[PDB]
């Protein structure tokens, strides 16, 4: 139901428990906004999941034995043969970061005016895929954008939507079928095994290549484990191994499931591609070798990858998070359902009911619960999309929980909850924010705001 | 009451997870005897909170920072200045842990036929002193005997009786006052400011010196600044100076509160002990300015016991025990009163009634823990006892217990949970734990090597 | 000259040490090209000085102190006010290496059909300034080109090329001036610090940027202190902080000088331009807060960039290099002169005279070397060249060189000696050296993946 | 001849470069005593081998998989298995150094009043066994204390002193022989191998025990690979192994050739022995599962002593030393030859014609090293043997200069060297030394001394 975590506290980092008051103070000072924060005033920081996880012990000895050489580095060696060995792909190019290995795939694989569909977007993937002249196709199924809706698997692509764009455009102007694993956006939600059979059947029917983001490819694979039919008796290797060999390729963030704080991957069968991706490695990320990573870091993604295979971890990592979800929601809070498996989504609709989509009530939110927990969250609702004069109104309104893995504990969440719940008596204080500074691209990093 | 950790987790340590048909095979490997487990094969091990923490990023920060000289080393002085500051001694000698001080402070204050009083006491310290040629005597409060009896402070020593030892004895006799912080024999009992101040008082009047054994003393201040009325307006630190200033040394092992996983080091404050300390270190330990530790680990243990001296640390740490005797005690599950700074201790005679302890029922108790848990917990009762080596027959102790030793930092109250639930589902059908037999018992120390077969 | 290293060796790293016969076989299995070997095969790897620096125990001890957070690290903040302080630029922007930073400014700075000017150029600083539209013109003096003539300071920028650039061209269309500091292509050549002021006091007068390619701006300064009159008696620091102050910005490769094995960074003052450079790091890098970096590698870099600041730190580094271009020079051995900062270059022209430039010399000589001594070294010559994609041919540069890179802090003089005895043992006879032919050729990089055999 | 160092350097150590005029004020603060002196002063400090060593990437990842397990830790596992594969013992004790095993052996062994007979004696070693009531015979042979007499292997026991003691004593007053590899007082001298098969030969044949302090043994092993002959084409492990073949038991101080900065272990091979050992290294060092030690640091001395047994390794580390020997004898200074595997030890007595053995000659010429140098040294002459009003006079008068491995480079070895020579020049200026504290017992260390 909720199991321990199935391993032990090696070494602890040093936080500030500062009271609140004095947390008040620090709110104020950064203008009520979560990403102007300092680390070293949040006492948990639920920002994201990126980047943030806590190494083993075999990561750390492994960071002691860096081979730091520009080429043939015995590093890039472990690395390479352990994602063969896992995703089952011809060729990997390590990059820093997922969005390096993403620069890397929209110049490879769009031409100018074709059409890239996917299960929702991502706000670095979307850009990519844009900057290179293709438009955005949204081929998830409607069920994905509803907060409340509580069914599983909510991340599948509809068949009838990807078959309606190859209908309509045709599969010479369909550049990729970019299938995320899981959907970040749709809070963190699954992709059953047989949604991606089913794009692979129709689109090699097409001749249509797919490519996926593999970023939190091990949580999804854990549900598909756990909830879908006859996968119950295989193991999270055996799952990740078979969603790979239904793709020509992917993207993957390491800094999310590979159980690191820096790094990605770039990987593909076609060996023309390979050949370009080199190519187009050197100038933006590194040699083929080390693709923009020292030594060490590409042999504690091996090492990670390696680690997220064990059940008992990625059971605990999903549950921890679905943990801090049900408490929320034995309370009466709501939130995006069902829980994801990275984040706990608070539906900022439902919390400031009586505020518009205009005041911005997810960013006040995340900003109040700094103010009263202490805790770090995201906005991923409005101001993620942006300021629009000719607002981007996206359908979810939301504040993201974002748990980093083999970090906190259950008492955290509980923390968390108990801080939240006490929130969501006086929602109504929540006050409006407006822009005053805006970024012309991804904009809610820099943009400044003050109450309306 | 129960607090969330007052920190992160920065790294993992990698456990097995062995399922329990794969737990009983191990255990049946291991003789019935936890202390012949692997350690690979323990998800949760309690065997001991010594040497077994888990230190912070800014320790393995100055993991990498060893001044590794053999004299002169930039740690030592960090060491040196720290233990100073918080402590209050003049001078420090380091140790690589806690029984090499005991070795060095038998050695320069006992003169053979004196004598050595104290709340109780400990094997290795009790050993150096015996060692040396000087009787023990206990001169706790007789609440300390009393295993059930849930008081406070139930280690802080009858003034009556050190009194009754003055007058009985010659105070010339005396060689010192060794008293305790916390009293592990106890539980984990800690001693009042109170009584350490009337102990000095009592002292100083007849020119007695007194050491204390401070391996657990930061958990032992977290006891002072929550029960004794007067200092919860005072920090921990401000305590712990307090509490050494009724002292003339102390003995000292960092692998409990200095939150290291070895180290240790001797205090006093007298000059002419001090140069006698500085001639006896380099025959046991090493020179002065390291005593048997590398630079990198006097680092570690600098660092360690500051970070020690955090309220919401060391409050976490006893509260973390407390809830595992706690949700015990709400079970009904039998366990010695009150729950000490750093382990739980089960009553295996109240456990296993349908046992003679003959039959070793906190050995078997221990083995059945680790089968249904993966938890490996410590047999305190008859088997570590020993046996009369004149008689042979068993030592038979009034207290037949198991021991949940929790290390600091390491573990979360989900770990607490799993040891809980395992117990208390053991508990629930007690009457089926059997009993044990010798199969192997070795010469001394049978504790370590033992091993057994179910009667 | 040439001084002892002003540091001890805290950690080794572990080699394999093979034999001269299974030294061929893996040179053969690599199909003669030393980017092909593996690094576990490898003694002294000389490929590059690029992330292959041995950082400090400050360092590593900056590694277990590393606020991975994704907004807000404390390791940003140590970085930020270091190069604030030391660079003295008002903003920072963090990449995860100096093609990233490139990456930045040429999108920031260049307008399409502009100019960009400077001291010769670099593959990536140059491909990223055309790839946004720009025209690269060379205005280094002359002297800079003549690869045998020993004077100081050849990368210098010839400052009545640039007035004639200003003159020919519109100043409004000139994008930026890109001073490298040190000039990696002329074999690691300096700049003087009356350079810097000259051609930043010609620009301010069109209102024309200078951005800085600082990469080796540290072993640049050191040239300063040695051999510019006026400079003797001025720090490294202050010299660093001077140069920089003739300059709107840098991109910074700290991998090079600031003695990490990943990490960058761009610099500039313009508030407006950081205000894109923010929003432009989040496409590409990250947030400005970590900018495609862990914590810990902030950290670092932050530490390394200080400690570069040594003098007797960056003073061995260079009389090492020295050292190995003044022992090959002794013994006959024809090298690019004179010896730059971070490595030498051997004119494989000059010494397999008896070989055509199409038999690839400087590839076969780099395959030599390792054979004899297991040191790895670079082919630059006419295999790095490449072809030309519209005609077939090959590129024919006037360098056909190998390239002896010498890592930060990494090896010592003997180390050097076994490079140095090797090649001149090659020297003795080098008319035995065999030209190489194709046998697998790529359609593009083929420096990296191309395989030869002997002719 | 002079090999380049069989490594890279992945780490380096920062060191202080205070001039010459700095330097004395920092002797003056220190008294002239290089045993006072802070390590943060000290530019190259040879005061000793012992726990100085730069461990490898390989032992800093055991460092990252410590098991801190009270018992059954896999670290002594690991530890265990590698001392009974190299040195041949069934049985080892951890313990926290050198000094800690001999606590042991000397409490296991000596019967109060029998005779302990080696080759010479080290500090700790010899107290130890007089400790417990045994006295001390020397039965190295003559040569060894003759510091200008360059033989091989000075260190070999005379084998008719032995047989001397056993017919002047008997065989059953005779608690063990204690052979040490190498001979750290007379120079590092080396002990063949045809000598420790003698010693066997004829212990055994009385029923003796022989222990050997195994302290420097690689060392050992590679003077007998270079030197003598039939071991040519033997490894250094090979050697190694025979070499513990004719003992029945070791001390090791892991301090020295394991390569570590702290640890050592206690070796027998009968049951009866170990069993009391398992006893008695409770009370003083800890649990026979480690022994006073760390996990990690049984790993790294487990990973240590195999990284040892490499020919190429221990080759530079011998011919380092040599290095330094070679230099200063040609320029025609002073020292004890041959050149040990360990350390160059300045001969006081030639260096310091004009002072007596009461003036101490060797503490004012290491004391006037660091002044002039900054280099550390230890006095290794008469005040390790002390002060005797009813002094212990030494035939070695010597000044130590102690070559920690893989710490240093020849380039530290020239400063060393040119630094010592200008010194050899004005020796007149060496004053001499009195002691103002004595300590009772190992005095040398807490010793103050004033010039008289
Ligand atoms: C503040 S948003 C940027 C970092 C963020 N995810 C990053 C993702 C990337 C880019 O990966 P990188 O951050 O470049 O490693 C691609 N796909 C997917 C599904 C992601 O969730 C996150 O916090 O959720
Ligand atoms: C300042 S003297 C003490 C440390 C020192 N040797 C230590 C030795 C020990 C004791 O070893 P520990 O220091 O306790 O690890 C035993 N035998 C032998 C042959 C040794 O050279 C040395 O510096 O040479
Ligand atoms: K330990
Ligand atoms: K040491
Ligand atoms: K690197
Ligand atoms: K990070």
């Known amino acids: 139901n909720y199991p321990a975590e199935p391993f032990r506290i090696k070494s602890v980092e040093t936080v500030s428990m500062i009271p609140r008051d004095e947390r008040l103070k620090k709110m104020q000072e950064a203008g009520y906004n979560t990403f102007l924060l300092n680390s070293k005033d949040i006492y948990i920081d639920l920002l994201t999941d990126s980047g943030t996880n806590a190494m083993s012990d075999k990561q750390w000895a492994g960071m002691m034995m860096g081979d730091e050489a520009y080429a043939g580095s015995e590093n890039f060696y472990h690395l390479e043969r352990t994602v063969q060995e896992l995703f089952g792909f011809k060729h990997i ?92 956006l749709a809070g963190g939600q699954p992709v059953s095994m047989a949604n991606m059979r089913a794009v692979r059947e129709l689109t090699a029917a097409h001749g249509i290549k797919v490519f996926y983001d593999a970023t939190r490819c091990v949580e999804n694979a ?38 690191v704080n820096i790094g990605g991957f770039l990987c593909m069968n076609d060996d023309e591609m390979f050949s370009s991706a080199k190519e187009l490695v050197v100038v933006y990320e590194g040699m083929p070798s080390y693709g923009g990573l020292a030594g060490r870091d590409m042999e504690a993604m091996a090492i990670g990858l390696r680690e997220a295979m064990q059940y008992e971890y990625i059971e605990h990592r999903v549950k ?50 700094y103010v009263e927990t202490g805790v770090r969250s995201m906005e991923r609702g409005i101001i993620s999309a942006g300021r629009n004069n000719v607002h981007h109104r996206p359908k979810l ?29 006086h929602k109504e204080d929540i006050r409006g924010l407006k822009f005053i500074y805006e970024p012309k691209q991804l904009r809610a990093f820099t943009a400044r705001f003050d109450y309306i």
Chains 1, 4 share one sequence.
Do not use: W
Not at 102 to 130: C, D, W
Not at 235 to 250: N, P, R, T
């Open 320 to 369: 921890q998070v679905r943990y801090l979800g049900d408490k929320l929601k034995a309370a009466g809070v709501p939130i995006v359902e069902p829980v994801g498996g990275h984040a706990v989504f608070l539906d900022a609709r439902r919390f400031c009911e009586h505020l518009t989509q205009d005041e911005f009530p997810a960013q006040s939110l995340a900003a109040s619960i």
């Open 222 to 259: 854990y549900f598909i484990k756990e909830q879908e039919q006859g996968f119950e008796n295989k193991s999270i290797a055996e799952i990740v191994h078979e969603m790979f060999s239904y793709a020509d390729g992917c993207t993957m963030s390491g800094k999310k499931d590979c159980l």
């Open 397 to 425: 309104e939301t504040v993201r929980l974002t748990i980093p893995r083999r970090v906190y504990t259950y008492a955290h969440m509980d923390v968390v909850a108990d801080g939240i719940i006490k929130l969501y008596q």
């Open 93 to 184: 190019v390590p990059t820093h970061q997922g969005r390096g290995a993403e620069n890397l795939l929209s110049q490879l694989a769009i031409k100018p005016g074709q059409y890239v569909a996917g299960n929702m977007y991502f706000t670095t993937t979307r850009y990519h895929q844009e900057k290179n002249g293709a438009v955005f196709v949204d081929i998830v199924r409607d069920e994905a954008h509803d907060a409340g809706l509580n069914i599983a698997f909510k991340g599948d692509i509809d068949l009838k939507k990807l078959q309606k764009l190859i209908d309509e455009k045709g599969a010479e102007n369909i550049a990729y079928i970019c299938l995320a694993v899981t959907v970040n």
